[PDB]
């Protein structure tokens, strides 16, 4: 069961602008407990290479290593939506349990790998499809054209239904799911903007802690560093946006829509039963075309209506972007 | 919500040896519904390369490429204990939710990152710390040496509990945790040599789809392939085992010992609460020392017994 919120994680990355030997750490707990400690999701190698005290000579080579590595920490990323979350249950009293019996979970939106750290995303709750309803099939004893008409209208309304549900799903995906993803977009840029300012204030300390002659005999410039980090960040944000787009579309296509389709297929099946029962109960009235109708019903209600994203998006620009990731 | 077992995931990776061309798949569920499909955690690019219809001419190069690839898929494996598992709540009714209030989970032992899949591990449950509340404080009437005795005994008994609980935790971490982790090593290596069996089955199906004078012109020995990826498999197990070792030792150091330390401090607290009430029910009988006792009490019961790994290993 749940215990922390994101605040836990985010506070760990925060610091106030108050000068001290502030260092990057790989422990959320340690960051949260020492105000001169800041949590990084970068590799320990980068941590050891940033917390390090460095003589004024090798100082400008230190910085250059960092900026390459920083770029290499924020841009070298990987992704997948293939994740096995395995919980192993240790019997402390009994005999050992069979690995078959251990717990397995793979229902994840996707995962962003940073060499130093893995970011996983899951979404809840599953979308709620409004109840689809039951077509009232009106009988007209001894009236072929009119009973045929209720069959035909039943099948048309059914198609409309697939359209309504799809439309419903897309509008919520745009209005509720993508809006949340956008806030994640913003938080990830922010996390990065903040990791840049951590590494920055760690350096500015070292250089604003040197013999005033070295401070002039070392060409140094904040805007120089405070730019090679932003372009580094924007470069990194290209992959992150790509990932988040992939998550958005994957969620629409592999979670939301299939859930809606399952519903519409049930609807189809019980409408199919109703219509076949209807046909049998009017088979006198409908003589000459019972088999035609029986088949038109079966064929129709056994072929799914494919989902066409382009029906429901009138931005085109948005359409172009999302279509890539299918 | 529902919990599921590893069973199906393991089954997904299984195939019967026949004569049909099995195909690797990145879909667990597709493999489970199809005898001809076997789940793999290698890159999708591996899946594509192995599932490829290959001509007799290009055969050997394709096998050799796969061996290299197989070695990269299994050796070029990264690891970490830094995982941020974030559940995003979607508000279907109302305004957007601040990311700050989404859920955050990070109690994993470690993560094994292959080119085509991430494997997260977590261990449950906490170890039961044996009942510490064992002794009661006997009220001796007007016997100062013997009330001071019970108090010195209680204090000397907690030092004993701390030790015994450390020993108990390390004991159960060798006999129970390290045992279950050694079954992880087993099922992992065994999975790797099922991926090796899969790929061999696929490559051997391809060799045995050619003409007889063609197969004669191709220096292919199914045995030297077997050795070649066993080499790769044993190679992979170095970093897998280093991982599990780091896993094993982190759980001891980061979960078990800290838990025991908490339940132990709970004990210490409860013991003062009862030692002082014992002093208030032993009014004055101890005076001339009341200070001296409470000081050595608080010196002792407000300070954890340092845990030293070397001692218990």
Numbering used by the authors:
A (entry chain B): 545 to 870
B (entry chain A): 545 to 857
From the paper:
Botulinum neurotoxins (BoNTs), the most poisonous biological toxins for mammals, are speculated to exploit a similar mechanism to block neurotransmitter release at neuromuscular junctions that results in fatal botulism. LC is a zinc-dependent endopeptidase that is delivered into the cytosol where it degrades SNARE proteins to inhibit synaptic vesicle exocytosis.
Two molecules of tHNA form a homodimer in the asymmetric unit. However, we observed a major conformational change in a central helical bundle (residues E620–F667) of HN. At acidic pH, the αA protrudes outward to form the center of the β2/β3 hairpin. This leaves the hydrophobic groove exposed to solvent, thus helices αB and αC transform into the β4/β5 hairpin to partly shield the solvent-exposed surface. The low pH conformation is facilitated by several non-polar residues (V653, F658, and F667). Notably, the highly conserved Y636 that is important for stabilizing the local structure at neutral pH flips out to be solvent exposed at acidic pH. Specifically, the tHNA homodimer forms a two-side flattened β-barrel that is stabilized by swapping the β2/β3 hairpin between the two protomers, which forms an antiparallel β sheet with β1, β4, and β5. As a result, most of the exposed hydrophobic side-chains of the β-hairpins are buried within the tHNA homodimer in the crystal structure.
